[PDB]
Design a protein around this ligand. Structure first.
Ligand code: HEC
Ligand code: HEC
Ligand code: HEC
Ligand SMILES: [Cu+2]
Ligand SMILES: [Cu+2]
Ligand SMILES: [Cu+2]
Ligand SMILES: [Cu+2]
Ligand SMILES: [Cu+2]
Ligand SMILES: [Cu+2]
Lengths: 455, 455, 455
């Protein structure tokens, strides 16, 4: 006998309601198998992968990850794939959990402006990745063509207060991390498995700040977690909390009470969290340069009463979360746009630099530029800064060590280099500093920084 | 008490029958512990890692992976390692599952033309990797020195219809992927964990096309899956199906009903599959550039009746499987040989290009070169192609965008670059196209392409 | 109800006794929850990451990994973090297993010369990584800022004969592997996840030779195994043995009878081993270039009677363990120091070369330089060596093939290149050989080798 042997579809055909990340459709809440009609449209379009950094994404339903599909084990699914007329490429779909060659791929080839359909029975309960399967497949996946399909057990999943949808992917731009402009896909970096960005839900900051996930003390949260890849394996982890349960795909095994899991490329898991104390809980790939240098962090923000018996301490800040502590970094987007338009003002630079200074500089120099006397020199009203702005560009790019005198006090420490900052970032940060804290004003341009970097 | 405490060996000494991949020895079918004599011979030899690409493999038993060994928990194994006189290197063996230092390594050092032996008790049921343990060990492993040993539980494994043997490895050539000739091992790429090929069973296409694994609807298939490494972890996955069971090494835990697993470097697992519907099921490393750009795909082809209640769709084709949809790519081997011999004909190039066109070009241009009107321009009877063959070389290497006119119709789309194709591949593909579909004939040489690439 | 609900702290406040790797504090042996005061001091200091290779480590408690902390589920922990006045950087802590934002990070920011404190309840039994959480976090972790905290179940762990503490990390030096001197951290290699060293307990040889872990036949050994990362996932494996049990973090799942596991970056596990037969058992990352080319090997040496019914063979030697078979390689440290001081003698070079020859050359040429007649040519009393020392430098760096005559006999084989050896290593090895086995003496300098490498 096949699994999912619940008899022929009954009732009326159901038109599936799909959701955009990070939301999930309601529980199916049904005791009979149905014919479920799923309609999903591929759209190719430019979106911001980071502030001021555009990328041509290929999407299922206009989002990365693609629209979430929710059905019941034993359902017959009539799957309709449309390819928007604006597309340049053909596309198709492989749904994990489908019983049949290619997971649908050979019956879903869809040229721009066309539609395809195929039917399958959902024999297999579980959470499953779906993705494009059009050669070169890795390119399609790298461009954002992946999402999740949930096939519920017949009795449904246990009730929880919130359900969310989070999916990791690795991305490959020609430019370096945070280099502005429209960035092409880079096949060389992709083949080498050397991503420039590693993200949740298709962009830096997609689930941070004002886009965080929410719940309250005492509530339960289920997260459907995918890893679209194409290539990386996630050391998936929640900072400051624990997973009550982790279940992969439709596996019989359920791990309980773990904080760090491994999610294969192409894999998916359901995790459960119980909110205990208020604050920001960070979902990361704990291959930690991905999380804190390439974009792979997402926030579940918990509202409610502190419990000093459990945790006496404070909410996170920029020391850990960096420039993603703040609600957003829209000033960076704005300054980048103004540069393109040729209208970049001092204040545009100042506000972009303010956003970028958080974490990146404030960890040592403080949010108010005061430093710490004799340990971290001040940027506020800094004689040393004012004396030589070009030296300050060199200090950001190349670091500084040795004895110096700042505002009458000696420092004898080490500031690490920061050459990974792009020329616009250095320029905007230094313009912010120059225009703060009784510093002399003026500006540093990206071209100024380019020249210092080349010397 | 030690595990495997089934008493002294009884009956007669048994000379183990080893098998070459992808086959497995018969179940031991025995109720008593035995002395089992295993004889394995190391052979160093050139073989084709891909069509027209030779590599000096170091092998246990003449194959990659090496010969499969099958014993029973509680057996006493007298292990004989011979090193063929033609060898240049010394070799030895570490069998996982052996209780003792190095898994046998210090008692199996075997110079060319010599033999070694050691005895161990198989205390540990499970599936286990064995490999060479001769410094530099990673070099030996990278050259193909790994295989599997099964230590059965005393009652035997449950009966299945088929048992197969599949083992992943990462490979490191001086040349790039599909660059022809005898390719040296590349220690720099190996240390960096940057393989040029990632393969099942020692070659591209080892388990595809006419070398696929077979079964029928309703049958059960057990696959002994190794990962020899040296360095990669497999996101091991079956496209279009599910694993009924996954069990690692001799672990007590058995996962059921998963599609994607993680197999450590040096690890092994037993998976079980039940054939439900006909077609090609693809075993892959779902770090998907490995599977679809570096060689890591294998096929289990299922014969039998369609079941439209389960899956309404079609068998896979080149869109997903690429140039491995076809039975083989022997024409590539032949053309490469003819180049070396200085006898390369137009028809040699045409047939090699035909093989390579599948997937790589046909996904957009179609198998018959017709394209799709106003979306994908034709290669069949293409005025644009005929007008400028050197432009066509540039288009393959560097891509094309912008408005063009082909056979009277305007196109305004994007063909991605394909610089990863080697000069011979570009040459042979374009010669195929030129000699098909009422195109003007002639040929493109590898040297022609080399010149365009250098400009 | 929260987990760990064992009531308010009782008894007296307990000042935790922390241990340095590879030792563990005693079992808590307590039936009531307590207030436990933990004091941990950050120290930045130069230490040898390899012989003659210095590195500026940032440490919790003066070691890498940091001091081991051991508490009981249900305890209230008052955590005190001090930052030594000699520090240049601020530091903080995130303990996995803490319930609260950042695992403590926002309440533990500690400038040089300062102290911080926070209190948390240990709700979660298990083994957990702790690490610094100061931007740039990956830099802090890469510099050595990680360790383990055990939160015992209320009844305690089962009694074992030995408990040890082992933690993997990936390291990123500007220089290549074994390049001498004080090596800076390399942010470029870190972002790319391309470590120069992969180590247990902060140094090459930290747990090999005279620093091996010990036990006796019949005894049980528990190892608390961390993976600090920052970036790599360990294919953690024991050569020649099996793990009775593997349990991750505080998971409910326990795997039994496996040899190879996967430990996520930031993850931790408890493994159990039962000693069966004498000899050296090697803990490795089985992404095997890490273990055998980058430093990731540790030894558990078992004393006691051989059991020929289980294993007839020998203890490991340099063929497998290489230059870590010997008790230590202190001669390398000494020679490097003498080079810096300008006092390097012939004998300093000889003893350093002796240490390095083991495995790296002896696998083919033998420990006594005799080779094997007509298969591996001799280095002992070698006419070919004596005839041209510069040719011998070229042979080490670039390999040798083709027919040669050595001491009257023809060889027609292949010696692989060894360009990864540094100039001092080549120099010291060849000086050893020249001063052994009736060879002519003299010396090769690092500058001699530099010149040959550049030609
Ligand atoms: C801690 C790790 C630091 C971070 C992050 C940044 N800076 Fe820094 N900076 C640091 C130190 C210890 C020193 C003194 C070095 C010494 O030789 O003793 C400095 C110095 C500067 C200066 C010059 C002195 C002054 O005006 O106070 C400048 C202009 C400066 N730092 C700027 C700066 C900016 C803009 C940063 C973010 C991009 C930044 N620093 C980060 C320590 C640390
Ligand atoms: C879809 C992703 C494509 C694949 C794969 C290949 N080609 Fe292509 N090709 C594609 C498009 C959209 C276009 C037109 C671009 C535009 O500016 O509108 C082309 C064009 C060509 C041409 C020139 C026009 C013609 O003769 O039809 C040639 C000669 C060509 N393509 C060849 C070709 C070959 C040999 C391929 C496999 C190596 C190949 N293309 C792949 C789209 C796609
Ligand atoms: C086995 C894989 C080898 C290792 C490791 C090393 N050497 Fe070697 N060496 C090897 C062979 C097969 C040959 C002969 C090559 C041929 O063309 O037939 C050699 C040769 C040399 C020589 C020259 C001949 C002689 O004097 O015997 C030298 C000086 C030499 N090898 C040195 C040497 C050193 C110092 C090594 C460690 C750094 C080393 N070899 C490793 C095989 C192998
Ligand atoms: Cu697509
Ligand atoms: Cu897939
Ligand atoms: Cu070998
Ligand atoms: Cu091994
Ligand atoms: Cu720190
Ligand atoms: Cu952490």
């Amino acid at each position: 006998k096949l699994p999912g042997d619940f008899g022929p579809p009954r009732g009326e055909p159901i038109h599936a309601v799909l959701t955009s990340p990070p939301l999930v459709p309601p529980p199916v809440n049904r005791t009979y198998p149905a014919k479920v009609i799923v309609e999903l449209e591929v759209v190719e379009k430019e979106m911001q992968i980071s502030e001021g950094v555009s990328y041509t994404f290929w999407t299922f339903g206009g989002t990365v990850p693609g629209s979430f599909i929710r059905v019941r084990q034993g359902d017959t699914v009539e799957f309709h794939l449309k390819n928007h007329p604006s597309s340049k490429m053909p596309h198709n779909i492989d749904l994990h959990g489908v019983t049949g060659p290619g997971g649908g791929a050979a019956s879903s080839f869809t040229a721009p402006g066309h539609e395809s359909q195929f039917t399958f029975k959902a024999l297999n309960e579980g959470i499953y990745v779906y993705h494009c399967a059009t050669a070169p497949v890795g390119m399609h996946i790298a461009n954002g063509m992946y999402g999740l399909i949930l096939v519920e057990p017949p009795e449904g999943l246990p009730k929880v207060d919130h359900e969310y949808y989070v999916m990791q992917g690795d991305f490959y731009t020609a430019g370096k991390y945070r280099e502005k402009g429209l960035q092409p896909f880079d096949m060389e970096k992709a083949i080498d498995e050397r991503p420039s960005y590693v993200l949740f839900n298709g962009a830096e900051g997609a689930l941070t700040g004002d886009k965080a996930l929410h719940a309250k003390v005492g509530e339960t949260v289920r997260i459907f977690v995918g890893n679209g890849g194409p290539n990386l394996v996630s050391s998936f982890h929640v900072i400051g909390a624990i997973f009550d349960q982790v279940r992969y795909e439709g596996g019989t095994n359920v791990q309980k009470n773990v904080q760090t899991t491994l999610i294969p490329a192409g894999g998916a898991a359901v995790v459960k969290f119980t909110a205990r104390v208020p604050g920001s809980y960070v979902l990361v790939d704990h291959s930690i340069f991905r999380a804190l240098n390439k974009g792979a962090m997402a926030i579940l923000k918990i509202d409610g009463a502190e419990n000093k018996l459990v945790y006496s301490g404070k909410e996170l800040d920029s020391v850990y979360l960096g420039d993603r502590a703040a609600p957003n970094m829209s000033a960076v987007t704005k300054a980048t746009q103004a540069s393109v338009s040729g209208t970049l003002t001092v204040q545009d630079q100042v506000q972009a630099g303010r956003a970028l200074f958080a974490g990146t500089c404030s960890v040592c120099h403080q949010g108010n530029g005061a430093g710490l006397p004799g340990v971290f020199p001040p940027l506020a009203k800094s004689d040393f800064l004012a004396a030589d702005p070009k030296r300050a560009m060199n200090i950001v790019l190349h670091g500084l060590n040795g004895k110096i005198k700042v505002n009458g006090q000696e420092y004898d420490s080490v500031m690490p280099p920061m050459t990974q900052l792009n020329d616009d970032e250095v320029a905007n940060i230094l313009t912010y500093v120059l225009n703060s804290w009784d510093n002399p004003g003026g500006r540093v341009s990206a071209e100024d920084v380019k020249k210092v970097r080349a010397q």
